[PDB]
């Protein structure tokens, strides 16, 4: 009968909508995870950069000292 | 046949709830995305500053090397 | 009918978010390369500074 077919069809449409929403949800969650990993990696990079800043500071101090010494040695000559 | 209407109302209500949750999670995702963006720009600034600083440091080191060579030539 | 449309809308917005995230991770990779290069240059400058200290010590020994 056409009635049962129409009923089944309506149910199928409902199922399509629900599935579509599920598809969006899951993809969104994938984006969430990837975002999280990206954040972690970026933070590691932050740490690395900060350490590099420390080392660079030390090297700059050393270079200043060397500049003073060279300055004096040039004063001598 | 009011039951037929009731069932439809139930289905639509459930679908509506799903849509809501989807919207909320999407909004949160957008917020976190904003966060990540700001953190990214900040990190870029840090990288640029670091590069500039060590460029200056490189030039200073080179100048030091030159002065050293010049002083060593006097001996 | 506000379900089949609000679904397409959220889908489009989601796609935009995905593209955004892609651009973001690209930028992140670029940052990775930057970090590597920075490390190389840093080590190089460290060795240079060491050498400078040695030569300075030499010049000081000459006096
Ligand atoms: Cl450095």
Curated annotation (Swiss-Prot), chain A:
Q: Which residues form a coiled coil?
A: 1-77
Name of protein: Vimentin
Q: Which organism is it from?
A: Homo sapiens
For the cross-link Glycyl lysine isopeptide (Lys-Gly) (interchain with G-Cter in SUMO2), list the residue numbers: 62
Modified residues annotated as N6-succinyllysine in this record: 27
Tissue-level expression: Highly expressed in fibroblasts, some expression in T- and B-lymphocytes, and little or no expression in Burkitt's lymphoma cell lines. Expressed in many hormone-independent mammary carcinoma cell lines.
Q: How does it assemble?
A: Homomer assembled from elementary dimers. Identified in complexes that contain VIM, EZR, AHNAK, BFSP1, BFSP2, ANK2, PLEC, PRX and spectrin. Interacts with BCAS3. Interacts with LGSN. Interacts with SYNM. Interacts (via rod region) with PLEC (via CH 1 domain). Interacts with PLEC isoform 1C. Interacts with STK33. Interacts with LARP6. Interacts with RAB8B. Interacts with TOR1A; the interaction associates TOR1A with the cytoskeleton. Interacts with TOR1AIP1. Interacts with DIAPH1. Interacts with EPPK1; interaction is dependent of higher-order structure of intermediate filament.
**Which residues are reported to carry the modification N6-acetyllysine?**
7, 27, 62, 74
| Functional note | Vimentins are class-III intermediate filaments found in various non-epithelial cells, especially mesenchymal cells. Vimentin is attached to the nucleus, endoplasmic reticulum, and mitochondria, either laterally or terminally. Plays a role in cell directional movement, orientation, cell sheet organization and Golgi complex polarization at the cell migration front. Protects SCRIB from proteasomal degradation and facilitates its localization to intermediate filaments in a cell contact-mediated manner. Involved with LARP6 in the stabilization of type I collagen mRNAs for CO1A1 and CO1A2.
Triggers of expression: Up-regulated by muramyl-dipeptide and lipopolysaccharide.
What post-translational modification does the entry describe?
Answer: One of the most prominent phosphoproteins in various cells of mesenchymal origin. Phosphorylation is enhanced during cell division, at which time vimentin filaments are significantly reorganized. Phosphorylation by PKN1 inhibits the formation of filaments. Phosphorylated by STK33. Phosphorylated on tyrosine residues by SRMS.
**Domain of life (superkingdom):** Eukaryota
> Hey, which family's this protein in?
Belongs to the intermediate filament family.
UniProt comment concerning the protein's domains: The central alpha-helical coiled-coil IF rod domain mediates elementary homodimerization.
The opening ranks of the lineage are: Eukaryota, Metazoa, Chordata, Craniata, Vertebrata
Residues recorded with modification Phosphoserine? 53, 65
- Subcellular location as annotated: Cytoplasm; Cytoplasm, Cytoskeleton; Nucleus matrix; Cell membrane
**Location of this fragment in the whole protein:** 162 to 238 of 466
Segments of this protein annotated with the region Coil 1B: 1-77
Disease implicated: Cataract 30, multiple types: An opacification of the crystalline lens of the eye that frequently results in visual impairment or blindness. Opacities vary in morphology, are often confined to a portion of the lens, and may be static or progressive. In general, the more posteriorly located and dense an opacity, the greater the impact on visual function.
């Amino acid at each position: 009968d056409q009635l049962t077919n129409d009923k089944a069809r309506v149910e199928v449409e409902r199922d399509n909508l629900a599935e579509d929403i599920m598809r969006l949800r899951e993809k969104l969650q994938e984006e969430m995870l990837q975002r999280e990993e990206a954040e972690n990696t970026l933070q590691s990079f932050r740490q690395d950069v900060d350490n590099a800043s420390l080392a660079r500071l030390d090297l700059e101090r050393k270079v200043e000292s060397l500049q003073e010494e060279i300055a004096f040695l040039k004063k001598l000559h």
